[PDB]
Design a protein around this motif. Sequence first.
Motif, PDB file in Angstrom:
ATOM      1  N   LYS A   1      19.351   1.972  -2.719  1.00 53.08           N
ATOM      2  CA  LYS A   1      18.046   2.283  -3.311  1.00 53.08           C
ATOM      3  C   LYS A   1      18.051   2.092  -4.826  1.00 53.08           C
ATOM      4  O   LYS A   1      19.067   2.342  -5.480  1.00 53.08           O
ATOM      5  CB  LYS A   1      17.668   3.739  -3.027  1.00 53.08           C
ATOM      6  CG  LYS A   1      17.593   4.122  -1.559  1.00 53.08           C
ATOM      7  CD  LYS A   1      17.161   5.571  -1.413  1.00 53.08           C
ATOM      8  CE  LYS A   1      16.862   5.937   0.029  1.00 53.08           C
ATOM      9  NZ  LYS A   1      16.225   7.279   0.122  1.00 53.08           N
TER      10      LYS A   1
ATOM     11  N   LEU B   1      12.845   4.730  -8.783  1.00 52.67           N
ATOM     12  CA  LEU B   1      11.725   4.421  -7.888  1.00 52.67           C
ATOM     13  C   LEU B   1      11.674   5.377  -6.701  1.00 52.67           C
ATOM     14  O   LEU B   1      10.619   5.920  -6.383  1.00 52.67           O
ATOM     15  CB  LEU B   1      11.836   2.987  -7.356  1.00 52.67           C
ATOM     16  CG  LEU B   1      11.540   1.813  -8.290  1.00 52.67           C
ATOM     17  CD1 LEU B   1      11.662   0.522  -7.496  1.00 52.67           C
ATOM     18  CD2 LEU B   1      10.158   1.913  -8.922  1.00 52.67           C
TER      19      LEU B   1
ATOM     20  N   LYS C   1       6.547  10.063   3.734  1.00 53.04           N
ATOM     21  CA  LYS C   1       7.178   9.218   2.725  1.00 53.04           C
ATOM     22  C   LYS C   1       6.633   7.805   2.736  1.00 53.04           C
ATOM     23  O   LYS C   1       6.487   7.184   1.682  1.00 53.04           O
ATOM     24  CB  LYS C   1       8.688   9.146   2.958  1.00 53.04           C
ATOM     25  CG  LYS C   1       9.464   8.747   1.718  1.00 53.04           C
ATOM     26  CD  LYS C   1      10.957   8.699   1.976  1.00 53.04           C
ATOM     27  CE  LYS C   1      11.699   8.236   0.733  1.00 53.04           C
ATOM     28  NZ  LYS C   1      13.122   8.666   0.714  1.00 53.04           N
ATOM     29  N   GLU C   2       6.374   7.297   3.938  1.00 50.54           N
ATOM     30  CA  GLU C   2       5.891   5.935   4.127  1.00 50.54           C
ATOM     31  C   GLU C   2       4.598   5.691   3.357  1.00 50.54           C
ATOM     32  O   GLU C   2       4.466   4.683   2.668  1.00 50.54           O
ATOM     33  CB  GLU C   2       5.678   5.650   5.619  1.00 50.54           C
ATOM     34  CG  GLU C   2       5.219   4.235   5.957  1.00 50.54           C
ATOM     35  CD  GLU C   2       6.062   3.150   5.304  1.00 50.54           C
ATOM     36  OE1 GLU C   2       5.478   2.173   4.787  1.00 50.54           O
ATOM     37  OE2 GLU C   2       7.306   3.273   5.301  1.00 50.54           O
TER      38      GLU C   2
ATOM     39  N   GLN D   1       5.297   5.547  -0.342  1.00 45.97           N
ATOM     40  CA  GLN D   1       5.907   4.242  -0.618  1.00 45.97           C
ATOM     41  C   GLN D   1       4.864   3.137  -0.714  1.00 45.97           C
ATOM     42  O   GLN D   1       4.910   2.311  -1.629  1.00 45.97           O
ATOM     43  CB  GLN D   1       6.898   3.886   0.490  1.00 45.97           C
ATOM     44  CG  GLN D   1       7.736   2.634   0.247  1.00 45.97           C
ATOM     45  CD  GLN D   1       8.745   2.786  -0.881  1.00 45.97           C
ATOM     46  OE1 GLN D   1       8.772   1.970  -1.803  1.00 45.97           O
ATOM     47  NE2 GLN D   1       9.581   3.824  -0.818  1.00 45.97           N
TER      48      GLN D   1
ATOM     49  N   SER E   1       4.180   0.978  -4.143  1.00 49.53           N
ATOM     50  CA  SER E   1       4.400  -0.470  -4.139  1.00 49.53           C
ATOM     51  C   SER E   1       3.104  -1.259  -4.333  1.00 49.53           C
ATOM     52  O   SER E   1       3.100  -2.284  -5.017  1.00 49.53           O
ATOM     53  CB  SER E   1       5.100  -0.903  -2.847  1.00 49.53           C
ATOM     54  OG  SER E   1       4.221  -0.864  -1.734  1.00 49.53           O
ATOM     55  N   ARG E   2       2.018  -0.779  -3.726  1.00 49.24           N
ATOM     56  CA  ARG E   2       0.675  -1.335  -3.951  1.00 49.24           C
ATOM     57  C   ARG E   2       0.261  -1.276  -5.418  1.00 49.24           C
ATOM     58  O   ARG E   2      -0.303  -2.233  -5.951  1.00 49.24           O
ATOM     59  CB  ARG E   2      -0.369  -0.586  -3.124  1.00 49.24           C
ATOM     60  CG  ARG E   2      -0.460  -1.048  -1.683  1.00 49.24           C
ATOM     61  CD  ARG E   2      -1.573  -0.319  -0.954  1.00 49.24           C
ATOM     62  NE  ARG E   2      -1.833  -0.900   0.360  1.00 49.24           N
ATOM     63  CZ  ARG E   2      -2.826  -0.539   1.175  1.00 49.24           C
ATOM     64  NH1 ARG E   2      -3.689   0.418   0.831  1.00 49.24           N
ATOM     65  NH2 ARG E   2      -2.959  -1.144   2.353  1.00 49.24           N
TER      66      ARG E   2
END
Lengths: 136, 161, 122, 96, 401
Positions: B24, B28, B41-42, B45, B49-50
Amino acid sequence: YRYTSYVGEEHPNSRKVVLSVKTKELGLEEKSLHKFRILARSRYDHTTDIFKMSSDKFEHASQNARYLHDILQRLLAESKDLTEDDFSDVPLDTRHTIAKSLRKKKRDYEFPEHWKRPEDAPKKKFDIVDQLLSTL
Amino acid sequence: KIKPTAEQLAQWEALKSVPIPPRKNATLDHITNMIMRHGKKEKAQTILSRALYLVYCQTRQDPIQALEKSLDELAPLMMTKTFNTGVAKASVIPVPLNKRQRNRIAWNWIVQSANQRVSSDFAVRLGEELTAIAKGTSSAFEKRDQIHKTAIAHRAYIQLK
Amino acid sequence: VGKRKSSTAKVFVVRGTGEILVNGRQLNDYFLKMKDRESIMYPLQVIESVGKYNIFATTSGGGPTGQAESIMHAIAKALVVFNPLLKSRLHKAGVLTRDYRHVERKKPGKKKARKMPTWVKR
Amino acid sequence: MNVPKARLLKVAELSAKIFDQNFNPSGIRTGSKILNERLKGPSVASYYGNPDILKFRHLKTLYPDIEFVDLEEQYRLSMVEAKKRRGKGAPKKMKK
Amino acid sequence: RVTPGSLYKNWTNTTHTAQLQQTAVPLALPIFNFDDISKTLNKVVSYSNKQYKSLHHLGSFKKSQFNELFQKPVCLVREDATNSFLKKLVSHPVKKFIITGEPGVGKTVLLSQAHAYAVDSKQIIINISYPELFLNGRNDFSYDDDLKLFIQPMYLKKLIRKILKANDPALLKSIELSKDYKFSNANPKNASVKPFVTLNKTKNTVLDLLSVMTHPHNRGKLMKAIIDELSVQSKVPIMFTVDNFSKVLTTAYSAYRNTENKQIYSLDLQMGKLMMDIISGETKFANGESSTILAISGVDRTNKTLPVALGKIPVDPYVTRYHYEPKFVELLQKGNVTEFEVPKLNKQEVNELIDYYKQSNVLLDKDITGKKWENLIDEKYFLSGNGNPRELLKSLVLSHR
RNA sequence: AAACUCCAUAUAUAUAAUUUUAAUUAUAUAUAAUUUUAUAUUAUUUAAUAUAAAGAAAGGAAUUAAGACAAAUCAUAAUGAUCCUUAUAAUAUGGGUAAUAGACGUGCUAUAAUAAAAUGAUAAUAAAAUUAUAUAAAAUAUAUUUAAUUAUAUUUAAUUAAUAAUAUAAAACAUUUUAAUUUUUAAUAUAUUUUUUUAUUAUAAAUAUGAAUUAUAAUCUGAAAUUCGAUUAUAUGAAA
Ligand SMILES: Nc1nc2c(ncn2[C@@H]2O[C@H](COP(=O)(O)OP(=O)(O)O)[C@@H](O)[C@H]2O)c(=O)[nH]1
Ligand SMILES: [Mg+2]
Ligand SMILES: [Mg+2]
Ligand SMILES: [Mg+2]
Ligand SMILES: [Mg+2]
Ligand SMILES: [Mg+2]
Ligand SMILES: [Mg+2]
Ligand SMILES: [Mg+2]
Ligand SMILES: [Mg+2]
Ligand SMILES: [Mg+2]
Ligand SMILES: [Mg+2]
Ligand SMILES: [Mg+2]
Ligand SMILES: [Mg+2]
Ligand SMILES: [Mg+2]
Ligand SMILES: [Mg+2]
Ligand SMILES: [Mg+2]
Ligand SMILES: [Mg+2]
Ligand SMILES: [Mg+2]
């Protein structure tokens, strides 16, 4: 005909008898076989060509077995009738079987045959003392 | 008898010089965890990232690196931590910050500044804020400066010195 | 065979060009979260052998992330057989360790494992 | 369901005839579920135990030779006697 | 509390609709032409200007793609996927395809390439990207009396406009009409003066017909006339295309309600019925080279219908109308639809894509600097699930993990 | 106290004609760690830190001593003393334990866009446990023009169970929608952002949040649902 018996106890499931037959093993013509299967409904599984049924209606096991036999005979008689009742145009209802399959899990997938590497497999290693020993 | 083959040995030798790769990017991952709430968490994330993608699109240069730089800039190197001080005046002391703590402080400010932006989607807001920080405009910077000034007052309140 | 939480992953690793099949279907179709895929890759990534080894994973039990982790664990063990000298390296990376983290049971008086019901001093 | 309805109904009726099970196409309340329910009475009755169980009374009937002693009964009798002695015995019951 | 410049939309919308393609490197890439595929068989290729113009009008380039990453939308040619499909289209007698595959494999992109090819080879294109608009009930509709079906005269107008603009007028105005046509006039000008607009047989043109502007209740009539005209003409090929055809297949009944409160059937509409007619051997186009190219979308629902239509599963009669509509299957069988599976990317193709992305400057620093190239490619292939292009792209750009 | 113990873990052996299969398992019997070794750096032969190589090796449960609090229980049960014995013992029919000014704990549901709702059948992915005082599958019918969903009815296929059923786990992830928000819509044009763009016109503090409260109609259990039960539908839509 599978019978069950609880040894020391007096269970009320000792009366339960279960008949079970493969439908192709029954002495039937093809049209009659289809009709028989249709009549069976939920009792006939189609993946395994098996028809089974259990009776717990009567007091004794032997009675129940006899009743099951009589039912089977009646079913066979119906299958072999064909007089003004064919059931050629009623497709096989397989909904109960698909429901059962859904309830269970499946491991249908397999290792790809083209992924195999017989050349990478471990070859027979030469053991000389073992060879010497083997005089028989 | 082990019997290692030649090709295997060569492969091992080749490996030996290479260090074990990190699983990792730590900063981040920390940020994503902070964003995240209900073990979801997804979603956190995806949001992060978007936002980084948006930032990249707005200013075409590595988004992660830019974010790290922003964090470094914003993160106040020390904090004037309050104390009871043996039942007397609450004599404050400058205290050095762990990397996470430094970047944690930065992130909360970043989030706050994003929340003033217009859109419904938080990810968009976040991305806009990150781009602004990269370009060089925030009240977060002002807050950091103020903190540093307050730390500068109380020079020798530090104990060990 | 690797395990984590409730998951169990039996994995056939073979020397053919690096393609994946999790549980009789494509990797991106099975594991939707990229993190899980990355985790799975990691044993092949600590070595320079992602692309070298074909992997046929077969999972059962648990959820997706745990399944992916169990697959990864299995893959590391599978790799260890191909070249025993890398075993130490894999262990160092943290792939050969079976992740023990087991779900704590609900204790009687407590609501969950640790979460107790509210206290009241007065 | 491209297969016709009437044919399916006929098939179902035939199946019902073959087995013992009834064929109710209209879907009316017949009352079948009232009777068909297995009656649970004997099991319910057998809850507390077998009332014919050996008691101390019988341990005199079976074995007269052995002069048994029921201890709890004897204790109770002794307590009663003590109560009688110290003026705390039961009052004589009204008949009317 | 909003300005013109500020981004107010949600993320996907923002990426589609806010021009962040502005700040991007110009790339002198080769041009997509079917006549010179031998040159650019396995390379990234920007479209021609004319193609782009047509493609945008049609609605080929879609929102959830990463077309924002570059100056303009870009694809690569593929021997296994796109080139083979093109060859099939050229060669086959029926010329009637449905582009199947897994989610993100590149069905749209294939459609866009097919459109571009058609543009190059002097063909008219009637594209219906996103049938959801006409199928779901989010625009006006009306039961026409002449045509025994429900017309939708907001969607229809838009579709007509797209047809007009996507295609060049020289190709479109080469077609003389078969019949004369009366329509209700609906200009701001000549409203009182000209109550009706009349198109004659030989004098008038298909372009002129398209440019007609009527009241809503004649719009469906106009559309019907246009389709008929296009069917009749043998001078130019007509490429019909419907992307996200999966939705159409699954959504058998629309959200529209007739006079009595119950849902209207898709085949009782104008648009859906027309589409079905085009698909089947019914509204047969006079010219050869006149194709229908349908495309599934992984977005939409899946069910037994499409597999049953194709050579996949035997027909289970007992499955429900919701999970299996037999009429649609029958229609599909009638017009001999040969399906086309989009294959996933090869290793070499993936590598080529990654190289292109690097050139355009999309790759992250951790990918490029301090990493072997072949190893990186292998990792990318692994993470995509062995060459799902969208997934690969996501791993490359939208990861940050 | 620790340890032996149980659960869980790793390995080995045994057994299972791999149709009761899940061998990726289950269960008996072992072995395994309160981990070991070495190089250094501080403090005095050892002990903490760091580094390295060897290992699957990382938790939870039960067990809560003596005394004390005249802590709780005579309403689990039993027993001492004491009091009742046509009544303070025993049975039936109904009512009450559910009363409502204020107050006090525990919870549940909320107060919308890093969050809610529709949908998702080659049915994305679990575990643990129950089914002879039963579990109830498929399918038909009605609510409901398609059908699915959800709820009932119709009727019991299978299994008293590693075999059948309860039961296609759910978040997840994906498309769609979402008032506050003229941060949108629709009429025109517009165009190389077309599930979209620009121009000009018209679009003027509780919702398309929440689900309390109530009205009517049905259904379920039971012999019986008024005080006083549980569903479904059509309305009602507080507070926050
Ligand atoms: N074939 C192909 N596909 C590409 C290329 N570049 C990007 N794509 C991807 O193709 C995808 C379109 O796939 P599609 O089948 O429409 O996805 P669906 O809408 O879920 O069915 C997009 O998400 C793009 O990221 C390319 O050069 N060739
Ligand atoms: Mg698509
Ligand atoms: Mg098996
Ligand atoms: Mg102890
Ligand atoms: Mg004690
Ligand atoms: Mg006490
Ligand atoms: Mg006391
Ligand atoms: Mg007492
Ligand atoms: Mg008391
Ligand atoms: Mg008592
Ligand atoms: Mg009394
Ligand atoms: Mg109470
Ligand atoms: Mg909400
Ligand atoms: Mg599901
Ligand atoms: Mg059912
Ligand atoms: Mg079972
Ligand atoms: Mg509401
Ligand atoms: Mg209020």
